[PDB]
Design a protein around this ligand. Structure first.
Ligand SMILES: CCCCCCCC/C=C/CCCCCCCC(=O)O[C@H](COC(=O)CCCCCCCCCCCCCCC)COP(=O)(O)OC[C@@H](O)CO
Ligand SMILES: CCCCCCCC/C=C/CCCCCCCC(=O)O[C@H](COC(=O)CCCCCCCCCCCCCCC)COP(=O)(O)OC[C@@H](O)CO
Ligand SMILES: CCCCCCCC/C=C/CCCCCCCC(=O)O[C@H](COC(=O)CCCCCCCCCCCCCCC)COP(=O)(O)OC[C@@H](O)CO
Ligand SMILES: CCCCCCCC/C=C/CCCCCCCC(=O)O[C@H](COC(=O)CCCCCCCCCCCCCCC)COP(=O)(O)OC[C@@H](O)CO
Ligand SMILES: CCCCCCCC/C=C/CCCCCCCC(=O)O[C@H](COC(=O)CCCCCCCCCCCCCCC)COP(=O)(O)OC[C@@H](O)CO
Ligand SMILES: CCCCCCCC/C=C/CCCCCCCC(=O)O[C@H](COC(=O)CCCCCCCCCCCCCCC)COP(=O)(O)OC[C@@H](O)CO
Ligand SMILES: CCCCCCCC/C=C/CCCCCCCC(=O)O[C@H](COC(=O)CCCCCCCCCCCCCCC)COP(=O)(O)OC[C@@H](O)CO
Ligand SMILES: CCCCCCCC/C=C/CCCCCCCC(=O)O[C@H](COC(=O)CCCCCCCCCCCCCCC)COP(=O)(O)OC[C@@H](O)CO
Ligand SMILES: CCCCCCCC/C=C/CCCCCCCC(=O)O[C@H](COC(=O)CCCCCCCCCCCCCCC)COP(=O)(O)OC[C@@H](O)CO
Ligand SMILES: CCCCCCCC/C=C/CCCCCCCC(=O)O[C@H](COC(=O)CCCCCCCCCCCCCCC)COP(=O)(O)OC[C@@H](O)CO
Ligand SMILES: CCCCCCCC/C=C/CCCCCCCC(=O)O[C@H](COC(=O)CCCCCCCCCCCCCCC)COP(=O)(O)OC[C@@H](O)CO
Ligand SMILES: CCCCCCCC/C=C/CCCCCCCC(=O)O[C@H](COC(=O)CCCCCCCCCCCCCCC)COP(=O)(O)OC[C@@H](O)CO
Lengths: 70, 70, 70, 70, 70, 70, 70, 70, 70, 70, 70, 70, 70, 70
């Protein structure tokens, strides 16, 4: 009697986040490198950025790799 | 019914930081060289400054190199 | 039938804080430098004071930069 | 309907600290020089004392230099 | 409603230290000369003792020379 | 036909509290400093005491600053 | 119709604490110095004891310095 | 209606500690000298033991020197 | 027409508790020290035990110190 | 009309714990020394074991030393 | 109405650990000597192994030496 | 006129739980050790498992030790 | 009147976990070694993996060793 | 009534990691050698890389060597 807005709403939210999450990732790299130059944080932040970027781009693939939502 | 201020807000914050982050980088180079002259810190700070400057200028390129936000 | 005291009350609170927040900032600089002389805290407090002062003076500009309240 | 004790309280606290902070600074110089004589700490404490004294005496000037509280 | 014990406490601590710090300085000179006789430490300790004694006796003068606490 | 005991009762309660609230504030400062000496609580209690004292003495002024009860 | 036991009760509690708080302060100094000898805690505890003792003896003066309870 | 066990309890605890703290101090001197013989720790432990012993024996005098508990 | 069992009942309950509360206090000291040995809880429990014992033995005196029940 | 099981129950619990708490203390010493050999924890655990053993054996004496339960 | 499994459980755990803790101690000696050959760690590990072995074999004796569990 | 099913029902419930509670205890040990390997929880879970196992096996004995149900 | 699914359900859950817990343990070893290569975590993770593996394989034996569920 | 995705999900995650963990290991060797050339880190990193590579390739074998998951 109505419209199913469950799948569409979830897809719309996913599309919206991808608009500005990538820009926020670039900000963190610039700010983190600045803090490292000032001797505020250790250098163990470099591997974190690469691993986090792997997870962000592989989010959809990882979920289906476990059999959920197929 | 409104305006999307997700991408614009992230871009505005990125533009603002680039106004004064470069000046802060020059301050660190001057202060770090002063501390080295006083025998307070080792000389291993020189490679750090070059590597940090590489990361700051390559932040946007590095993010898209991993496929995020394209 | 009455008076709108929403904008005025918020403005009055903002004006009151600016009277004594700046004096409190000077106290922290003096006390933090004293603790550093005593070998109680590391020197990574110096960049914090500059960054915090940037945020305090740019509070109004930063809010409107994101499109809120215009 | 009352009295504003925001600016006065902050000023009173600042005036009180300046009574005994300078005496504490002289104690640190005497004790630090003693520890250096005993071969307990390195000589990199001498530049710290001068820099800390610069910050303590310039606390008020530095805050207004950034535009806060004017 | 009470008594201010900020300046007095700092002065009392300064007076107490001067009672036994000078005796400790004489002990270091005697022990350091003994170690030098045994070929345990280099002779670069002699200039350190003179410079440390200059700093201990000039602690109060040096603090006010920078404008702090006047 | 009677007496209005609304404003008087509120004023009487306010006057009574001011008799012993200030003494209770001094107790907290003494006890809090004792706990800090014992390594039981962090040093972030010092700014709390100053801010709370500002609020207690400015209670009447703050209420009228928002236009209530004038 | 009764007796006001607000100011008296607060004063009585303050007087009681001053009987045994000073003895507890001496215990902490003795125990803290013992732990330092055993290489369990750093030497940054010495400035804490002096600052805490300043606060304990100045509790009443500090409260009235801000205008509360006068 | 009862007995005040605030001052007595604090005094009893102080008396108990002095029974075995001095013996523990002698153990540390013997063990620390052993570790030094084995080339495990530097010789900067010798000044620490003297300074700690000064603090332990002067705990009561130091507290009253600041005006607390008199 | 009957017997007043208000004061007697309260006194009887107080006497009963004092029979086994002290034994329970000794159990806590033994168990708390065991947990500390196992690195389960911090050492800030030691001051708590002394302060709690002061309160337990001074319960009757503290109540009458405030003027209640005299 | 019944039996008082307040003092007896507390005594029974105390006696039960002393059966196996001492064996648990020996386990901790053996395990802690093993972890130290593996370079997992610092050597500041040795003074903790001695102090904890002092507290466990002196639990009953310490409680009565403060006047509780006599 | 049941069985006391407090002393037995503690004894069983102690017996189990002694089965494989000694083998783990031999592994550490072999691995630590290997790291020393590679110039990765200093030679101050040799005294640690002897002292740790003394503590492991004397765990039960040390506990009863202090009067606990007898 | 009927049958007393009070003691029997309580005994039956106790017997049923002992069938699968022990298996659940083994699951927790396996899962807790897995979480520790992943750096999700601290190592203070090991003493908890031993103490909980002591309580489970001594439930009946502990109840009668206090005189209840005999 | 029904079927007892208490012991069977607990056994079924235990059997299911053992299917994939071992594979998860191998993943942690591979990932932990990778983080160590990157200088992100200390080397004290190696003893943890061995001890955790001992606990996982001995879960059933350890539970019955204490007398629970026999 | 469904599908068991416990073993398969764990296996899939293990297979995915092996795709890019080896490439990350080669990056660390290249970067670590660069830092060594610049006199930033000591040469004790060479044995770490070999030992970490041994652990990564032996993860599955080591787990079953202890009896887990067989
Ligand atoms: C994209 C690729 C980027 C690669 C990374 C950038 C590389 C830039 C060069 C530096 C490292 C060169 C290789 C290592 C040289 C060999 C190692 C060496 O000589 O050791 C020290 C450095 O000396 C040295 O060279 C010292 C001089 C090195 C610097 C050369 C001049 C550069 C400009 C100077 C202003 C800084 C500007 C920083 C931003 C660019 C000794 O010295 P000094 O006895 O003091 O004891 C310091 C301490 O030990 C005190 O405790
Ligand atoms: C898919 C697989 C991904 C794998 C993970 C990514 C790997 C990327 C490389 C980093 C780790 C390399 C292995 C470890 C190197 C050996 C360990 C080492 O050298 O240690 C520090 C790092 O130095 C170093 O190399 C420092 C340089 C390492 C980084 C190399 C250049 C990268 C670009 C730079 C901009 C960042 C962009 C981040 C996003 C990509 C010393 O340094 P620094 O004395 O400062 O004391 C810092 C601190 O100790 C201060 O408290
Ligand atoms: C908008 C952009 C803003 C950018 C952010 C502001 C930047 C302002 C400069 C600071 C960082 C400079 C770069 C880092 C310098 C290289 C790193 C360095 O030298 O390390 C320490 C700092 O030394 C140092 O320079 C110490 C001196 C640095 C400060 C220079 C003088 C400033 C005035 C002083 C009063 C404070 C006023 C704060 C408000 C302005 C060593 O020291 P110290 O052996 O003590 O061991 C401390 C600790 O390790 C003890 O545990
Ligand atoms: C606004 C700008 C401010 C700038 C900052 C202030 C500058 C004030 C001078 C100091 C640094 C000079 C540059 C560095 C000198 C070259 C480096 C040098 O010589 O090294 C050490 C210092 O020696 C030295 O000079 C030692 C002497 C330096 C101090 C000169 C006399 C000053 C008064 C003395 C009382 C202190 C009062 C502090 C408050 C003013 C050797 O020594 P020493 O073998 O002991 O091994 C110590 C350790 O290595 C033991 O582990
Ligand atoms: C209107 C505007 C009001 C503004 C608010 C009031 C401001 C008043 C100053 C305090 C904050 C200063 C800025 C922060 C200083 C930099 C931060 C710093 O040093 O950190 C700690 C504080 O040390 C410190 O300074 C400690 C000293 C700070 C206090 C200075 C003396 C004040 C009098 C003392 C009696 C109390 C009376 C309270 C009522 C007035 C270290 O310490 P401590 O190693 O112990 O580890 C404690 C913990 O971490 C243990 O777990
Ligand atoms: C109230 C005032 C109190 C003032 C404080 C007390 C002062 C008591 C004297 C000590 C410091 C003397 C001044 C410094 C001497 C000059 C500095 C010196 O010689 O350096 C080291 C100490 O040597 C030395 O003297 C070593 C000998 C110094 C001690 C003299 C005999 C004292 C009794 C011995 C039993 C301890 C009892 C401790 C409690 C009293 C070399 O040594 P060693 O090559 O080993 O490398 C150790 C390490 O570097 C290994 O890594
Ligand atoms: C109102 C104003 C008040 C101002 C605040 C009070 C000031 C009172 C002096 C202390 C700080 C002096 C300035 C800092 C000195 C320079 C810094 C310094 O030397 O560092 C440590 C302290 O050494 C030192 O001086 C140690 C000696 C400092 C103390 C001097 C004697 C005081 C009496 C002793 C009994 C305590 C009584 C406490 C209540 C009064 C080294 O040491 P140690 O190798 O052990 O490594 C400890 C750790 O690093 C181990 O992990
Ligand atoms: C009326 C007035 C009463 C005043 C209150 C009573 C005072 C009684 C003394 C305690 C506090 C002393 C001042 C603080 C000391 C300086 C602070 C200090 O050393 O810190 C810890 C305590 O160490 C320490 O001293 C530990 C030893 C302190 C206790 C001294 C022996 C007492 C008897 C022992 C049995 C208990 C009986 C309790 C009932 C009496 C370090 O330790 P540990 O590395 O373990 O890390 C623990 C944790 O951090 C682990 O997460
Ligand atoms: C109950 C009482 C127990 C007492 C404690 C046990 C005592 C057992 C002996 C050791 C300490 C002897 C006293 C100190 C010796 C004088 C100090 C000395 O020589 O210094 C180092 C040790 O050298 C040395 O002796 C090195 C040799 C010392 C060991 C002698 C052979 C022992 C067996 C070997 C297998 C280990 C088995 C461990 C378990 C038993 C130099 O060396 P190396 O240039 O390498 O720079 C290492 C580093 O500096 C690299 O950074
Ligand atoms: C009632 C009064 C009680 C008083 C309290 C008890 C006192 C019992 C002695 C210990 C402290 C002695 C004073 C401090 C010694 C000087 C300080 C010292 O040497 O430092 C460490 C301890 O070394 C050391 O002595 C290590 C040896 C100290 C222990 C001496 C043998 C005791 C038996 C051994 C089995 C344990 C049984 C515990 C229950 C009794 C170095 O070491 P290690 O390079 O490893 O770096 C560890 C870490 O830094 C690694 O991160
Ligand atoms: C009746 C009397 C019962 C008494 C109670 C039972 C006692 C059983 C032993 C444990 C405590 C030993 C005393 C404390 C040891 C000294 C303290 C110590 O070493 O600390 C941690 C534990 O390490 C350690 O020993 C870790 C090893 C301790 C366990 C020894 C092997 C036991 C079997 C293993 C499977 C579990 C089976 C559980 C059921 C029996 C460090 O570790 P790790 O760096 O990981 O940081 C963890 C965390 O800090 C991460 O955030
Ligand atoms: C399964 C069993 C595995 C066993 C573990 C692997 C073993 C692989 C060899 C290394 C250790 C050899 C034993 C120790 C040698 C004796 C000790 C020695 O010489 O000391 C340093 C290392 O020098 C040296 O050899 C330096 C050369 C050692 C390496 C030999 C060539 C290897 C390939 C190179 C690319 C890395 C690839 C890493 C992955 C395979 C001096 O140097 P350098 O003055 O620089 O001061 C560095 C620092 O002190 C600066 O602060």
């Amino acid at each position: 009697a109505g419209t199913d807005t469950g799948e569409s709403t979830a897809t719309s939210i996913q599309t919206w986040l991808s608009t500005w999450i990538p820009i926020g990732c670039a900000i963190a790299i610039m700010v983190s490198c600045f803090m490292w130059m000032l001797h505020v944080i250790p250098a163990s932040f470099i591997p974190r950025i690469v691993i986090s970027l792997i997870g962000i781009g592989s989010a959809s693939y990882l979920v289906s790799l476990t059999g959920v939502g197929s």
